[PDB]
Amino acid sequence: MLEAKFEEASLFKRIIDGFKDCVQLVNFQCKEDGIIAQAVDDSRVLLVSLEIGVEAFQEYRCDHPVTLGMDLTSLSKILRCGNNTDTLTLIADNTPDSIILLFEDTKKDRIAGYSLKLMDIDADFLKIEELQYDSTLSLPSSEFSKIVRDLSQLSDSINIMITKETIKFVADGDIGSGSVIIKPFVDMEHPETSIKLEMDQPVDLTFGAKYLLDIIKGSSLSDRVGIRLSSEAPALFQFDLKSGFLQFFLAPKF
Amino acid sequence: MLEAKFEEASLFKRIIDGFKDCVQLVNFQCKEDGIIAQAVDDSRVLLVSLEIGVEAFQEYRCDHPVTLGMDLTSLSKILRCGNNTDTLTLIADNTPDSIILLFEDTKKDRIAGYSLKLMDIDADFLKIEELQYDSTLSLPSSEFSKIVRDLSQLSDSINIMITKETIKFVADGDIGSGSVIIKPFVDMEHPETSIKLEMDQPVDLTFGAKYLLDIIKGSSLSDRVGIRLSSEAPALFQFDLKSGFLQFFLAPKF
Amino acid sequence: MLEAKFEEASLFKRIIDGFKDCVQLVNFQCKEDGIIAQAVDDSRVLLVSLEIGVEAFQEYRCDHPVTLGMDLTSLSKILRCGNNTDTLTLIADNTPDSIILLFEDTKKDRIAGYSLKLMDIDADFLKIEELQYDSTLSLPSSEFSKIVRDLSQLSDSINIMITKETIKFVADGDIGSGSVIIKPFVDMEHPETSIKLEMDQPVDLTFGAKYLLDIIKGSSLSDRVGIRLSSEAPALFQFDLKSGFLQFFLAPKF
């Protein structure tokens, strides 16, 4: 039995919005301590791990863990009915064949009850997170969003390279080149909105932009994206939430 | 001879905007007491009846009734030249081969004179309005607009059913279900913006959404759409105007 | 050697925006006194001549004249990286194989360095400007923009005709007709925003709208477009700049 309600329906949509570089389809494991999901690129090159905690909801109740396999595209659509930011409630039962979605308005007071036919897919769950990453850095999602979108113009292949206190975003296609090169630093100034690099190694990794754009789509979710990168491993892009995160592991080329 | 001028050109466009689920083509019967038109779906399943009264214009003059058969799509385009909301004048003569359209600005004072080649089509005019409808109801266009657009996601086939003081909008496609269920009621409160049901029978009618969306397009014209529904008959959706209406008769499935 | 920096990057984009009815490709001759370019329709019917002066830049330095042949579409894209209105710097060297573009923010202080592979195209440069034009007129770009876009609906062929103190923009396709007829005049009133006709002859010229729309795209650049027209010759549409212009010579039909 499950009753999970976001105060602000806007949220769950945004989260679901971070698929679509995900395989139209996904399992939503609903434990006692919230929800997690796992989607993978059709060619197994990007992985989206989601985690939403109890404190992220307005109210949450899961009596016994239940796994909600569903078709994203489909669930995506139902979320359109959602006038975003008022009171999506998710619901399921002892044995679930469909998940129920209750949008609402509290004091305009119009409630609609949509159900989605549950898919039931086979769940090979992955734990590829490394402990140590050659480099970690975290800049504000919004900036990264441009740097991605901007380089994505020139090249199909965006190269990220970190040198001592120097991060270099370099795209080089056949039409031309471009490079964004930015300090860490920290202004004691605005708010956070600063650049944070802790380096253990140099790195020279290069990723398909097509994916980067699909990653940075979840730029809306956080203020600040944390990137981790290592040679023999993939890169981890992390957007943070009230008491959970959305994260994209994306394999580098070569 | 005809000289018909809307003060606000915005209007006539909006009205013409309620075709397009109409057959690119239509007769515009211009009597002494205003204009009426009649379009039908290519497959004869939707009917759009328009009526615009004298009081709806800023000025109107028809010396002898005249029938203006014209190509909507074409006339639609000329209306684009219209900076909406300033002084469309329609014009025609004793025997008409083209209708003239004079857009203007009163005190910016730029006038443009467009003519449209009159089509001349054969006019089987229909009077299928029943006297008694099993149920009448009227809610605010804007709400209905969502309920239509929203259910239109899940199903291709939206079912409207009225039970004693309970209207149920139910869409059930193969991807999932959805149901919007709303009271009548009346708040003595805001303005009108209330829900009005007078029931004589239960009804369980189901219509193609594809059409419903084409009907609710004319949501802009009124504040409040009046729906009438009966079993052996079609449904009548009515948007109201200064001294006239636009209305869609749409046949139910089965 | 070249260092050319617009204070407001917005500008150079807008200028480049006035191609696309230009052959994806163009030479940019960078003299000591600024830049000029010349593009032509693939079928040689429209010509775009650009001239940007020193005073139009924030700073400009050309040590010896250099010619920058480049692919518009490509250069167009790099300009997207430009958050329009902050500090595009163009750069090239003694012998140039690529032009470098430095976007910036002055006190947000994020700099990106893009290079574009220089094309090298063969330069047949044209000087078809007549001295005397049967008629000159200049109205505000914005008005002309509508009159073009509006007539462009009815016809494929827009006819401009100037009679004594009467300019007549007439489109007549097969769907219908339209005519915009406007006085010169002058209100000593608003600002400029007046209509200016000096006539030496009648004219009855007719141009492809498809092009007119491509011409009036550069409506953003000036407030006021100057049109010149002569029978045996093409028409000259001129948009004006800080210390230069963009201009379209377009041949009339027949």
Supply the angle between the helices C72-81 and C9-17 in degrees, to the nearest 10: 150
- DSSP assignment, residue C191? S
Which long-range CB contacts under 8 A does C219-223 form with residues at least 24 apart? C219/C141, C219/C142, C219/C144, C219/C145, C220/C14, C220/C17, C220/C141, C221/C14, C221/C15, C221/C18, C221/C141, C221/C246, C222/C141, C223/C140, C223/C141, C223/C142, C223/C192, C223/C193
Q: For residue A65, give the 3-state DSSP assignment.
A: coil
Provide the H-helix boundaries in C155-248.
209-216
Q: Which amino acid is at A217?
A: K
Asked if residues C118 and C96 have their Cβ atoms less than 8 Å apart, the reply is yes
Question: B169: distance to nearest CA of chain A, Å?
Answer: 10
B82-113 burial, b at 16+ Cβ within 10 Å, e below that, comes to bbeebbbbbbbeeebebbbbbbbeeeeebebb
A72: left (phi over 0), alpha (psi -120 to 50) or beta: alpha
Question: C1: distance to nearest CA of chain A, Å?
Answer: 20
Q: How far apart are CA A244 and CA A247, in angstroms?
A: 10
What tokens appear for C169 in the block? Answer: 């923009």
Exposure of A9 by Cβ count < 10 A (0-12 exposed, 13-18 middle, 19+ buried)?
buried
Taking CA atoms, B254 is separated from B55, B162, B179, B208, B212, in Å, by: 41, 18, 21, 11, 16
Q: How many CB atoms lie within 10 A of CB A42?
A: 10
Query: Could you tell me which of C31, C51, C27 has the C-alpha nearest to residue C40?
Result: C27
Q: Which amino acid is at C124?
A: D
Please report the number of interchain residue pairs, chain A to chain C, with beta-carbon separation below 8 angstroms.
43
A153-165 burial, b at 16+ Cβ within 10 Å, e below that, comes to bbbebbbbbbeee
Biggest CA–CA distance in chain B, Å, is: 58
What tokens appear for C70 in the block? Answer: 């480049």
A98 neighbourhood in chain B, CB within 8 Å: 176
Q: How far apart are CA A26 and CA A96, in angstroms?
A: 16
Residue C147's φ and ψ, nearest 5 degrees, are -45, -40
Provide the H-helix boundaries in B95-232.
141-154, 209-216
Residue A77's φ and ψ, nearest 5 degrees, are -60, -50
For chain A, which residues lie within 8 Å of any Cβ of chain B, measuring from their own Cβ? 71, 74, 77-78, 80-81, 83, 98, 110-117
Asked if residues C6 and C88 have their Cβ atoms less than 8 Å apart, the reply is yes
Asked if residues B150 and A112 have their Cβ atoms less than 8 Å apart, the reply is yes
Query: Could you tell me which of A51, A116, A123 has the C-alpha nearest to residue A90?
Result: A116
Give the full edge-to-edge strand order of the sheet including B112-117: B59-62, B2-5, B89-92, B98-103, B112-117, C176-182, C166-172, C157-163, C203-208
Question: B112: distance to nearest CA of chain C, Å?
Answer: 5
B176 neighbourhood in chain A, CB within 8 Å: 74, 78, 98, 114-117
Q: Experimental method used, please?
A: X-ray
Asked if residues A173 and A157 have their Cβ atoms less than 8 Å apart, the reply is yes
Q: How many CB atoms lie within 10 A of CB B231?
A: 12
Q: How many CB atoms lie within 10 A of CB C185?
A: 11
Q: How far apart are CA C149 and CA C160, in angstroms?
A: 14
Instruction: Give residue B125's Cα distance to chain centre.
Output: 17
Exposure of C97 by Cβ count < 10 A (0-12 exposed, 13-18 middle, 19+ buried)?
exposed
Asked if residues A78 and A114 have their Cβ atoms less than 8 Å apart, the reply is yes
For chain C, which residues lie within 8 Å of any Cβ of chain A, measuring from their own Cβ? 71, 74, 77-78, 80-81, 83, 98, 110-117
- DSSP assignment, residue A150? H
* Chain A neighbors (3+ CB pairs < 8 Å): B, C
* Chain B neighbors (3+ CB pairs < 8 Å): A, C
Q: How far apart are CA C5 and CA C64, in angstroms?
A: 17
Q: How far apart are CA B166 and CA B182, in angstroms?
A: 6
Asked if residues A27 and A237 have their Cβ atoms less than 8 Å apart, the reply is no
Question: How many CA atoms, within 13 angstroms, populate the side-chain half-sphere of residue A38?
Answer: 12
What tokens appear for A254 in the block? Answer: 């070569």
Closest-CA residue of C relative to B73 is: C175
- Resolution in Å, one decimal, please: 3.8
Question: How many CA atoms, within 13 angstroms, populate the side-chain half-sphere of residue B17?
Answer: 18
In the numeric block, the tokens 């909301």 are attached to B85
Q: How far apart are CA B201 and CA B49, in angstroms?
A: 26
Supply the angle between the helices B141-154 and B209-216 in degrees, to the nearest 10: 150
Closest-CA residue of C relative to A146 is: C81
Q: How far apart are CA C5 and CA A236, in angstroms?
A: 38
From the candidates C76, C78, C103, C107, which should be mutated to test the interface with A, based on the most A CB atoms within 10 A? C78
Q: For residue B75, give the 3-state DSSP assignment.
A: helix
Query: Could you tell me which of C4, C12, C10 has the C-alpha nearest to residue C31?
Result: C4
Query: Could you tell me which of C21, C67, C76 has the C-alpha nearest to residue C44?
Result: C21
Q: How far apart are CA A220 and CA A142, in angstroms?
A: 8
Q: Which amino acid is at A22?
A: C
In the numeric block, the tokens 């499950």 are attached to A2
In the numeric block, the tokens 């052959």 are attached to C23
Q: How far apart are CA B44 and CA B249, in angstroms?
A: 11
- DSSP assignment, residue C218? G
Query: Could you tell me which of B28, B44, B21 has the C-alpha nearest to residue B215?
Result: B21
Q: Inspect the interface and report whether the beta carbons of C112 and A175 lie closer than 8 Å.
A: no
What tokens appear for C184 in the block? Answer: 């010169």
In the numeric block, the tokens 């919230």 are attached to A34
For residue A114, give the nearest of B146, B177, B182 by CB distance: B177
For residue B78, give the nearest of C143, C153, C182 by CB distance: C153
Q: For residue B61, give the 3-state DSSP assignment.
A: strand
C83 neighbourhood in chain A, CB within 8 Å: 146
Query: Could you tell me which of C66, C96, A254 has the C-alpha nearest to residue A235?
Result: A254
Q: Inspect the interface and report whether the beta carbons of A110 and B143 lie closer than 8 Å.
A: yes
Element (H, E) at A70: strand A66-71
Q: Inspect the interface and report whether the beta carbons of C177 and B114 lie closer than 8 Å.
A: yes
Taking CA atoms, A41 is separated from A128, A214, B100, C104, in Å, by: 15, 11, 58, 36
A193 neighbourhood in chain C, CB within 8 Å: none
What sign has the CA pseudo-torsion C239, C240, C246, C250? positive
Asked if residues A46 and A77 have their Cβ atoms less than 8 Å apart, the reply is no
C63-88 burial, b at 16+ Cβ within 10 Å, e below that, comes to eeebebbbbbebbbbbbebbbeebbb
Question: How many CA atoms, within 13 angstroms, populate the side-chain half-sphere of residue A61?
Answer: 9
From the candidates A25, A78, A84, A105, which should be mutated to test the interface with B, based on the most B CB atoms within 10 A? A78
B180 neighbourhood in chain A, CB within 8 Å: 110, 112-113
Angle at A213 between CA A209 and CA A214, to 5 degrees: 115
Asked if residues C162 and C106 have their Cβ atoms less than 8 Å apart, the reply is no
A182 neighbourhood in chain C, CB within 8 Å: 110
Q: Which amino acid is at B219?
A: S
Query: Could you tell me which of C139, C144, C145, C151 has the C-alpha nearest to residue C209?
Result: C151
Q: For residue B37, give the 3-state DSSP assignment.
A: strand
Supply the angle between the helices A209-216 and A141-154 in degrees, to the nearest 10: 150
Residue A212's φ and ψ, nearest 5 degrees, are -45, -45
Q: How far apart are CA A20 and CA B54, in angstroms?
A: 54
Element (H, E) at B72: helix B72-81
Give the full edge-to-edge strand order of the sheet including A157-163: A203-208, A157-163, A166-172, A176-182, C112-117, C98-103, C89-92, C2-5, C59-62
Exposure of B193 by Cβ count < 10 A (0-12 exposed, 13-18 middle, 19+ buried)?
middle
For chain B, which residues lie within 8 Å of any Cβ of chain A, measuring from their own Cβ? 143, 146-147, 150, 153-154, 174-182
Query: Could you tell me which of A112, A140, A157 has the C-alpha nearest to residue A239?
Result: A140
Question: C183: distance to nearest CA of chain B, Å?
Answer: 10
Query: Could you tell me which of C70, C69, C63, C67 has the C-alpha nearest to residue C1?
Result: C63
Q: Tell me the residue ranges of DSSP E strands in chain B.
A: 2-5, 25-31, 34-40, 46-52, 59-62, 66-71, 89-92, 98-103, 112-117, 135-140, 157-163, 166-172, 176-182, 196-199, 203-208, 224-229, 235-241, 244-250
Element (H, E) at B15: helix B9-17
A227: left (phi over 0), alpha (psi -120 to 50) or beta: beta
- DSSP assignment, residue C27? E
Asked if residues C191 and C172 have their Cβ atoms less than 8 Å apart, the reply is no
Q: How far apart are CA C146 and CA B105, in angstroms?
A: 14
B148-163 burial, b at 16+ Cβ within 10 Å, e below that, comes to bbbbbbbbebbbbbbe
For each of the domains in chain A, give its residue range(s) and CATH number, in order of start.
Answer: 1-254 (3.70.10.10)
From the candidates A79, A81, A97, A116, which should be mutated to test the interface with B, based on the most B CB atoms within 10 A? A81
Q: How far apart are CA B133 and CA B124, in angstroms?
A: 24
A92-110 burial, b at 16+ Cβ within 10 Å, e below that, comes to beeebebbbbbbbeeeeeb
Asked if residues C175 and B74 have their Cβ atoms less than 8 Å apart, the reply is yes
Closest-CA residue of A relative to C76 is: A153
Give the full edge-to-edge strand order of the sheet including A196-199: A66-71, A25-31, A34-40, A46-52, A244-250, A235-241, A224-229, A135-140, A196-199
Indicate the Cα dihedral angle A141, A142, A147, A153, nearest 10°.
120
- DSSP assignment, residue B141? H
Q: Inspect the interface and report whether the beta carbons of C71 and A143 lie closer than 8 Å.
A: no
Q: How many CB atoms lie within 10 A of CB A65?
A: 11
In the numeric block, the tokens 């409040």 are attached to B224
From the candidates C153, C166, C168, C183, which should be mutated to test the interface with B, based on the most B CB atoms within 10 A? C153
Angle at B48 between CA B42 and CA B51, to 5 degrees: 150
Measure CA of the first residue to CA of the last residue in chain C; give whole Å: 46
Q: How far apart are CA B241 and CA B51, in angstroms?
A: 9
Q: Inspect the interface and report whether the beta carbons of C175 and B98 lie closer than 8 Å.
A: no
Residue C75's φ and ψ, nearest 5 degrees, are -50, -35
Query: Could you tell me which of C10, C72, C68 has the C-alpha nearest to residue C40?
Result: C72
What sign has the CA pseudo-torsion A36, A41, A42, A44? negative
Q: How far apart are CA B202 and CA B104, in angstroms?
A: 51
Asked if residues C204 and C159 have their Cβ atoms less than 8 Å apart, the reply is yes
From the candidates B13, B71, B81, B91, which should be mutated to test the interface with C, based on the most C CB atoms within 10 A? B81
Indicate the Cα dihedral angle A92, A98, A101, A102, nearest 10°.
-70
Asked if residues C222 and C56 have their Cβ atoms less than 8 Å apart, the reply is no
